[model samples]
Target: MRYEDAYQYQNIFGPLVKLEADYDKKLKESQTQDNITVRWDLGLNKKRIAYFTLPKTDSDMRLMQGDEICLRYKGDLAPLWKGIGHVIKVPDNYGDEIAIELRSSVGAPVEVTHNFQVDFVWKSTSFDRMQSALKTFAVDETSVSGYIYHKLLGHEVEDVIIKCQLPKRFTAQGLPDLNHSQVYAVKTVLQRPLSLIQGPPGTGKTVTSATIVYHLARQGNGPVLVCAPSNIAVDQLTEKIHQTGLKVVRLCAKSREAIDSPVSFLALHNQIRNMDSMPELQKLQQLKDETGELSSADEKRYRALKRTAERELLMNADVICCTCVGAGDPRLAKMQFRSILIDESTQATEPECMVPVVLGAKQLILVGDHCQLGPVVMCKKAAKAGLSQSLFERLVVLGIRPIRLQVQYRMHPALSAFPSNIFYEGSLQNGVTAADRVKKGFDFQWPQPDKPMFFYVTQGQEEIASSGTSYLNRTEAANVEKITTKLLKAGAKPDQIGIITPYEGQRSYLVQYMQFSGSLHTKLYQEVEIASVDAFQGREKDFIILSCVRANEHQGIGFLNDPRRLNVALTRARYGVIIVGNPKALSKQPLWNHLLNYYKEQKVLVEGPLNNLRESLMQFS
Candidate 1:
């Protein structure tokens, strides 16, 4: 039946008109009354169906069973109508014929005859109205900047703008004068061939780096490669850029969608790996396919994909985020970036860190906290024999400069005092300290009196030995018990507490202990979450417990007594930090003794008797 004719029939059939109006009002009222609406079959036999409204509705005029009708409502309100049921049942007067019932306790219901017709002129009309409303507001794209533009390309652009647009100016005015370390960092960026910004915990290195990036982007430089040693740091930097509305192209291994683009091609490392193993070149050809001509948006996605796929394509990315391994690959030497910002650079060796710069960027910015961590040097025998000096030696050979950042922002003033000595050179005072830690040798600082740094020393070198199954198991149990208690008292959630160590043996032991420790009601992450120095490098946590189990004389000092590993473990804390073990054992070795002496003379090391150190160690035992 024609929709218009049905309407006319409704007017002619006054009973049908009354019933329809009543049911419609009931459905509307029920749906509007409550936040949640549900429908269930009301028929006793379960064959005939009616949709019951929730809460309450005024009308009982339900459409008959087998009724053919269409109901229209706002699509946004569909979620509210979830679980609503429809059924048919016999009406009070109709002994045989079934009536259709649409019921919700809190919303409206409608009923109609078996062959009733429904016409929705409202659907198109509603869409048109929405479009008209949207047209009233103008969306200015240029008003967005920094990461917002990047987000727009990802189809997530909503509310993002440049820092310059903020009502509050980000100037140096009223702020304390730049410390010697910050001044050095700024100068290194402006002057040196390779400037390292060693930012301690809470130092504003990230913000400072963002400021530097903002200035560089404003200059309309060709492009800058923002490289980090790990994927987490890359993600973080990318997020910061997005928050600032900076336009940037994130370069990394291509994803499946990226490779599928029509205008550009992406060959992921996995794809390459598989292709390399293929028996014939023709087998590799099977991987290629044509996606045909693309839309403007598709073209942009294609370009972004291509820019990330090929190292040479990096020249086109406004900002490229890559692992230190990828940036340092000799194959990338051919590409030329206008500038480079190496975040968490201290986590990498000079050789590993210099790869992005060697790509021939005109300017370089290295951001990190030297006191936090160093690089990953794995060869212990070579390191002990001095056969494999250090990666920083390469930086010296290559003429790379260093910069230090001094300021505590993430930690309570008390927590920051001790780590300052472990990582920084000279004393930390007045928001700055002398740049005494060399780009190469062991350097330490002692904590000031009345503000002594805490150290927990365990007796017996054998007790702390990070080797052999028996010794490791005991050490792990003690370490977990100590750390768990300390973290709990510090008001840190179990999820927020991380126990880091250089050895897998210790990690395994701790995992086993934590699994059995019923009192510690915290989540113990798996091995993937329990990182070695390399994995922990360039990462930070709310609270960190360093289980330096390898504090024997055999283990050298200055980091894992293994230099590279030392660089990774020390830098993972953002707020509170605790290192439990024998500092005396660590200081027994020449390298370790040198670091201790450096800490003592500089007054950066936490001072106390060996017993006091032992007690402090128990805080995390």
Candidate 2:
């Protein structure tokens, strides 16, 4: 059959319509509709596939085994079929077809096109389903059955009566009187054991997180362990919390403060004073030698100073701030804390988030929006199989819930909408509010027309390098020179412009060439650094020129997906962003394919200075 005919048959008579009709019938037949399972079998040595569609009421889908199903042609359903098989696994979200295994009945499995759908009922609305329904009600009052009961009765039901009591609030003050926002917040905190808070750029997730932490702390729960994936964020939050009169201790690799047992502020200050007096002791050594006598009083004073330093290092405080790695250290096993508040939580992997949770906290407050970015390390097997971190899967097993902060407090509202669509589901609520406030608070000098933002799409790395005169050194010498000249002509100071990349080697090479380029007057110092995305996180430059050199056809840019790295890269610019690379070459790889589609979907304009390179890139498959 021709592709068009197959399309029509699949569109008209395939599983989509069949499943809809089947679901409606099942819903009417059984008063309580549960889940629909669709199985497909494409007879090939390739991976198995299946899809499980939950009730529309459910936000995500349950998993089905892959061995029992297969993919037909693109946008065609009959090309695939379902067969009997052992259910090996199930995961969240059935939107992506699943894989499964099957028991072969004959010498060679027959390849026939078919689709099957099945609905699983509660065997008889047994007591177990009833208990589950009640528990769901206790946790989420808005659940289908929960809503019905409350609507009819006109009063709230105690969670314990439903056998789904909410987690005990660990506040010094009792839980705030539950209001709409409180109910929504509490329900999310309990339902999702782990959640992704995908806020847009300039969303006051930080401020909102701070308010949440303050409320959590007021409940007089144990120490609120606040951590971020980046050291810079840790510092920023530490400073913000301090301004609020909340004592916070930062556990960074470079911190000089010595923390002893019962980590507190007095101990830290004593350590500082003791260190300052050590040099004074050194100065006294010369005087003692000259006098041929050492005062016993001086010796006792030094000893006393040392003792004071030890005492000061042991004061435990209200808040402990650190990077994810520091917070995960085994030493924290002995520390006492009531709740864990993780800022920039979305930037971390499940394993990273687990470290603090395992350190004896009753409540876990995860902050960060997923729509902004995903985890950084992308494995080939994981990517091909659509697998994410096992830690994330483990959280799913534990029922971690999420609370979304839909407001955005940065970027123009119009500009925010575009990136928001790329990262979020357009559910963000506070973009306009934030944009209006920020616009009134600050002054921005928009770029001139000649220096309008440039988005280049090259054919491949060869074309990008060849577009310049030099070979092998083009990425460093030619590309760097060109960007610098453009910025200079656009009235941007050398110190105000920054160059960043996903690779350290690339940054180093570019920095070296720029340092030696006699025409450039600025020096490349650590303070004015060209760093990898991970290093430059939580920082911004007046202008940014991104060299997407390795963003080529080599199996897709794996590091770009690192949530922390991507978050850092995307938020680094304050004025303008210039992405120079070939989108087509990168699109050939699955990882970058989505990025190409995103650009097109967002209606992003593209322009190139080199005609040949542009033409070559336009010819991408």
Candidate 3:
């Protein structure tokens, strides 16, 4: 598994790069939709917004807020034309509608809306950057230090200790004080050339990462580079770093400038507009906004001015935060970062992780929990060839021990016990007690008052969804609705509870069932969050209700067999958790059998109505 040189590294990973790119290309292009129903309107920004629904429903073909797509109108009433739009809204309301803003305000045939086709506009920017990073790491000698490059290439090199002044206080201003485990993680990162911090759920991973970046920025090793695989992860880390009184700039893709986030004010594009020193640039921006267009000569001048402003903003920043692929932007192509830190590193593929590593990094810090989900690979060939394995998991297998943060502050002691023993080898310690997580005045009944956890046994039968790629159980969906209503009637706010299921079919079904058939207001059901287990990772709710929809005699429990997925689902609650599933079917697996036995021993495994719940005598096979 170790490579001697960069050439060997490229030789092994080059095909994987091509494999993923080809799979991605085919997947995106095949998402073509015909006869999409369109609703057109003009936004307050004076841009035209097109709202539409897909011709068919498929859980795998989901579009996000920043995705690029082509909206085409080829009707006989008007000449054929296609316009590009960036997705600005996606199903935030329960209506399941998508809205996209056209790039150009003029020339949209909104009057005629029939016979339209929408195609996914696939961009090779991220994949191409990965390939280029790999090539550069092989060709350029100065891309990284000799020791660092050798270690990255899997060569057994002597470990060297970096000599840097450690701070007397590990706490950063405007942030909570670090615990003992968090403080030790930050201290260990400063002394090693390469470091990995294993942060379990609710262990203050973001705080630990931000503190490390704060110390690295002050060491004068150039501005610290921070990155993550997802934009949400990057935004969260960026906000944390900005709280420590550091000047942070969040770099985003040019196409995503219109999409607003919590840290939009810190984005480079927004920061440039508020710069008082660039009065001329502001005046030109105003003119462009009013006219909606600029002449070729003026446009050239605008581009030249914008580039200069962007460089100035980035140069003065104490820390630069962006996605892993965003680090390979042309703006940062000429900049070198000696220190880089990537959060949620377990969620990124090896090539994706290397996109930021080739930016002349001498010290690299990776912070994530490999016990959770890793990178998602769609192509079977690519996945079988080991493209799904993360760089963090690989490093652990290569004998690099990760320092684990032990104290979890998110979950109550009763809720954290099972995941601690099953996933973390009983190493996880609870930082919060039952009293700390008590829900005062709540009326819902628990089998054990001290332990606000239960396993509601169901005999739901599974069936293939209409989409034919996923499974759902109607009986399970009904139980999920009743439990949600019970929580709502017990004084839990809509946002305080989360419903997690493994299959998208169950997710879609539960949302519809709770809204239409529930004995509550429609808006209340809509406000409650429900989604797949993957969406709930890195997040927590005050209470959680999980629906396991697999209840067949054969073909095994699908998607529920991964211990990592179950770990994520079990740890996403702070106060209480309720699990509803068929124990007879789930106990076919060893893990589920053990879990059912534990629930039985605790006397929380029950069956019957919410008002008169009774302990179940159903035995696990």
Candidate 4:
């Protein structure tokens, strides 16, 4: 149904947006931690970096690169003070310590660092943009085409297929050859105005989506807009789309301007510096870079010149790429895109998906796997009210059949056996064989030499963390370090191995235990990545060790209850997978019971030391 009245739009989305913001604010504020010890150092950019350890545990409050934090100090030698800084580095780079760049270092009490506090500062930029986009779609008749406006709100509208000429070959230059299914997905997307492509793990979703963008850019339509819910997803798609010989420009938020990526050269800010025709703009940029600021009049002139330069570069591009919220940028307020595509659409909430949908889109395409994790809603009230459902999922429930990519190239035949049967209804075919995935000459003790997977029984007791919101198992952490040492000794590169746990408490514990207790060099332990299952959802590794930390006879499995999470964790291993958990506690769940039975039949379910493994005859009940 069309929302002809402007108030109808506000009435529908206003309360939901407020509820989500409230939940986000509450969660962020609750992450305040005191008694933090910090180290001070100067970065290469001549800015102060405050290194500190966050002594709390919760995946909901994990800090990212662009998040804001308020570092406060209250000491007797100085007045109580606080300063806002943006996180430029996370634990992945600094050995379990996070670094934030302070706006100014004049008042920082760097000498006395024992007593300090860190508070998570939440920004409502994305939510505010979403609200504005909804209002624009309601009041502005030109926000979207007539048919699309109605179709987006689930109104009954006749389908109209655009008559665009299809390419004879779907493969684009500088990219791999497309399979039949990939080519079919591209062809179908070009003919229809609204399409959904479901890409399972390792199905070359990037290649398929890039091929579609390549064809769409040549249709003489206005610049094609590509977006995802996150910066990393946008960058991945931008790099692939750039490989197709199209003029692609990546737009990043101002807060993340300093953060570097593999495709930074294709970023709009980087591109503006290379414009030879704009000598005056170049001179001003150089001066600003060297001096960090200019006089007020010069600053005004510089901004004007930069705005023109940005517009010219954007106007000449074939495709624009950014996060979904970035589509609501004031710079793009006056621009319109006839074709829009959202990657990883299943991970974005419905309102977030609408941010790009209202940008005057005539043809829209969404690419993701709904069978995997959906949007994460921190507020129980909002999530219970269905705020976490994505537009792709709602469309599926409304009877839209997504074209599923059939073959997966990431996992070996033995590894893909169970997820295929349980999650995909046994329709997922393995593109690679068992021999293809074999790690030649790297010998490790396996219960079955043929199968490179097993479930190691652990009797670890779970304890409530200091935050009282998460759990950690000491035995699981120690066993993970042992398994990691064995993998490194077996010739697997530290970078190739990944350890994923369901709890933040376990993740933190695993990182520290492996670093200090590991027998190998310290650098090896630092090279290995340990994170939550949500962090490893769209990624893969050569070897994976999953630590299920919840072990109790009375309490249920906390985060492991979701079958989709199990599917993701199980499928991340390309060559082998080792699961460490208490089978007695896990087998209480039906899916886990089937999985344990599968490992039993394969004869890979074993216990004891890695050097001499033996099958465990443990009963479920």
**Candidate scoring better on TM-score of 2 and 3:** 3
* Selected candidate, larger TM-score, 1 vs 3: 3
- Candidate 3, 96-202: lDDT as tens digits: 56789999976988888678888889888889998998888888868888877777767788778867558988898788898888898999999988999999997
Cα lDDT, all candidates:
0.43, 0.44, 0.85, 0.83
Q: Per-residue lDDT tens digits of candidate 2, residues 519-571?
A: 54634221234544544444556666666665345542423444434444655
Record all residue pairs in model 3 with backbone atoms less than 3 Å apart, i.e. clashing.
none
Summarize candidate 1's per-residue lDDT along 1-621 as a digit string, tens digits. Answer: 111222232232233223333444444344332221223344453233333222121112233222222333334423322222232332211011223333333343222212221211111221222222122111322222323222212233233222332213332322334455665455446543344565655566665665556546655556666777665576666555444545554544321122222111222232222234333432323333234356676566554544344443344445555666555433344456656788877666433454454454445566765444554333443234332322333333334345566665554454444445555653443332222211122122223422223334444344433344323436434755665554455455555556666554555556555556635553433212343554445456656666556544453333555643553454455444455566655665454455445444434444244223312222111
Per-model TM-score on C-alpha atoms: 0.49, 0.52, 0.94, 0.94
Per-residue alpha-carbon lDDT of candidate 4 for residues 1-621, written as tens digits (9 for 90 to 100): 235454575577767877998889887888887788889999898778898876554342256677778999966767788998888867641246778999897678877777898888888988898788778877786777777666666777777776655987778878888887888899889998889999988788988888899989987656899999988788889999999899999988887777678788988888888478899988888889889699999899998998998898788889999999989888787888989999999999877888888888888899988888898888777777777888889888766789888888998888899988998888888778889998877978778887889999989789987478678899988888888899899999988998887676777777677767878988898877777677777778999998888888544433368887888888898999999989988888888899999998888888888788999988884
Candidate 1 matches the true fold with a TM-score of 0.49
The prediction achieving the highest lDDT against the true structure is: 3
| Stronger candidate by lDDT (3 vs 4) | 3
